[PDB]
């Protein structure tokens, strides 16, 4: 059987890295891209077509769920897997980002944070949802520190963030089921300032965990500062254990976070943007309700291989999205979702025959041009 | 290669009938059920996954498509059936029910009806619209006189469309690649009154059509006086064509007209109120959004052979309509449709055995239980 989690990493060219986790669930191939499922669903696909695209892991948010149907109750009624219909790895967020973002009214303190959808959510409890849930990768719960931050906000904040990771490891071993079944992951905070950067990673590493997940960025820093933060930020962090940037995002984004060194990925940008009407190529983005495309026969993109792209034209999806057809959201999701796919096994590939530099500069060179 | 059009009746059981109609396109098995497409879809399905469900042809409605994208655009792209991957017969309705339900501002003449969605939409153009787009059979352009309607007015309308029957006839005729490949229906009218059906029956078999549709009907009347007027008016029609009741209609109107000799059916019913979260079961409909559903780990329905009915829950179909997620009217309409499908599989092979009788009987004790 497989183990609980093993991560191993099979190439390398410069700081990025190709290999797989190992998990009772499945494997994952790293570089990994995770489809987003909001609400116990990846928006507009069934698990089956998630899987066709070739996404091995799928991040689950909790903030709906704790909501409705409730934690307990999708436990009772046997789990997200059974409930959602998908058997594979699941990463669970804590809760928190969305509930800073989502909640009419929020109320922080050392023990949480209370807010009004009143509820409290903890590391404590956020760990027992996640639980609940049947996470395989557990997220500790942590403060996302708003951009920008002065240094001495930045470090009561990582403080904070460093003893609620403490806080989550004790709650995540104190359950011998989710202590034996799933990983648990930590978070770094610290802005943009590499000393307080640093003194997160050691204090993450002294706790000990699965997985180490950059976190506070993509939060409106833009590209330049944020490749300038992974540049120092990522090789503090355990070598030997996977890096996940949360939340990260636009194609480019993706390529550039491996070049330094990180192995997973989330974001909602292929989902939603996807039933917005903007579908990713090769030759980057389009938004297929410009009239452009309106007697366009060819595929989204000339060279995907997705079902969507070998049965339907631009000019049928247009139609579809100009007239507010779900079927119109279904396509553009499944082709986005593909397209990132792809990506990643092209990312995957390049770095296991020692080309992924000339890779990413052919990649930017054409979706850029 | 299969006949432009032959229907044959291998089986009968008092008034009610099972065979086929062979087509270029494909084969439909009768007494048949017809899923709706509107602009080019059947809503939240993919046709793959209309075809799993078992049909063997669609409705395709006109009146959005010869807006947008337009009939000439349509024809420019390849046809309806390239442009939304669906590769069997179609029917395509004549534009102008829609046109009288769906319109800001309308104005008839013997010409035609003029509209504001403005156009004017005549037999000729109808006819001409549904050869653009490509149909397999095609209906004749007919007013869907309103109920109640007085016998003089209910006259005067099917008077009008028997000459706009005529006008059909003969412009579908006109068009040789059309009369070669495609078939042409005729509308009975005469809302409730036995005379004016006859009179209307007489001048379409006169006109003569490869079938004969039975129009004005399900407009408010109620079930008691549609089976009335079916049961005088279906026998008028002739034998050996396929008989179409239009826009019907819920499970028992289904099967009580079957018993009155109808071999077609079409409605949105499974579609619509599928994505409202109404699911059909054997044991009647059930509201998905009931809190009764919450913790429902039951399938749909019980006994429901389709895809959706082996892999997930009531209670997780209840989420996700509540949620307002995509996904929900996905399953839903699959599921429906499917029970669509095995509710005429079950007619036919019930007609095939000489037991359709005791399928109703039974059918309804169970349904209205
Ligand atoms: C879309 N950008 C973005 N999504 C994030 C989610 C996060 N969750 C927990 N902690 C984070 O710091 C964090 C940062 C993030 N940036
Ligand atoms: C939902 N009920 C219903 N949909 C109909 C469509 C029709 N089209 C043409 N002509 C008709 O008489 C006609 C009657 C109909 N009744
Ligand atoms: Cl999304
Ligand atoms: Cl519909
Ligand atoms: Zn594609
Ligand atoms: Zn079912």
Chains 1, 2 share one sequence.
Not at 189 to 210: K, T
């Amino acid at each position: 059987d497989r183990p609980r989690f093993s991560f191993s990493i099979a190439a390398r060219e410069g700081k990025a890295r190709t290999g797989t986790i190992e998990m009772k669930r499945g494997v994952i191939r790293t570089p990994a891209f995770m489809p987003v499922g909001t609400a116990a669903t990846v928006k507009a696909l069934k698990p089956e077509t998630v899987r066709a695209t070739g996404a091995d892991i799928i991040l689950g948010n909790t903030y709906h769920l704790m909501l409705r149907p409730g934690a307990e109750r999708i436990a009772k009624l046997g789990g997200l897997h059974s409930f959602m219909g998908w058997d594979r790895p699941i990463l669970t967020d804590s809760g928190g980002y969305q509930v800073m973002s989502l909640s009419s009214l929020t109320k922080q303190s050392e023990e949480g944070v209370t807010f009004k959808s009143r509820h409290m959510l903890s590391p404590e409890r956020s760990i027992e949802i996640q639980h609940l849930l049947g996470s395989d990768i557990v997220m500790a719960f942590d403060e996302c520190t708003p951009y920008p931050a002065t240094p001495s906000r930045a470090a009561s904040s990582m403080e904070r963030s460093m003893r609620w990771a403490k806080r989550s490891r004790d709650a995540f071993d104190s359950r011998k089921e989710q202590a034996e079944n799933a990983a648990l992951f930590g978070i770094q905070q610290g802005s943009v300032f590499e000393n307080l950067r640093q003194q997160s990673a050691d204090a993450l590493a002294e706790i000990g965990f699965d997985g180490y997940a950059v976190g506070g960025l993509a939060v409106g820093e833009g590209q330049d500062e944020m490749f300038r933060v992974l540049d120092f930020s990522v090789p503090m962090l355990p070598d030997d254990k996977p890096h996940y940037l949360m939340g990260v995002g636009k194609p480019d984004d993706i390529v550039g976070a491996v070049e330094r060194g990180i192995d997973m990925f989330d974001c909602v940008l292929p989902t939603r943007s996807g039933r917005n009407g903007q579908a990713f190529t090769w030759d980057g983005p389009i938004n297929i309700r410009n009239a452009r495309f309106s007697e366009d026969l060819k595929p989204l993109d000339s060279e995907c291989h997705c079902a969507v792209c070998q049965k339907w034209s631009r000019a049928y999806i247009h139609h579809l999205i100009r007239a507010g057809e779900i079927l119109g959201a279904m396509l553009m999701t499944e082709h986005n979702i593909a397209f990132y796919q792809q990506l990643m096994q092209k990312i995957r590939d390049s770095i296991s025959e020692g080309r992924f530099s000339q890779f990413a500069q052919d990649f930017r060179a054409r979706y850029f041009a």
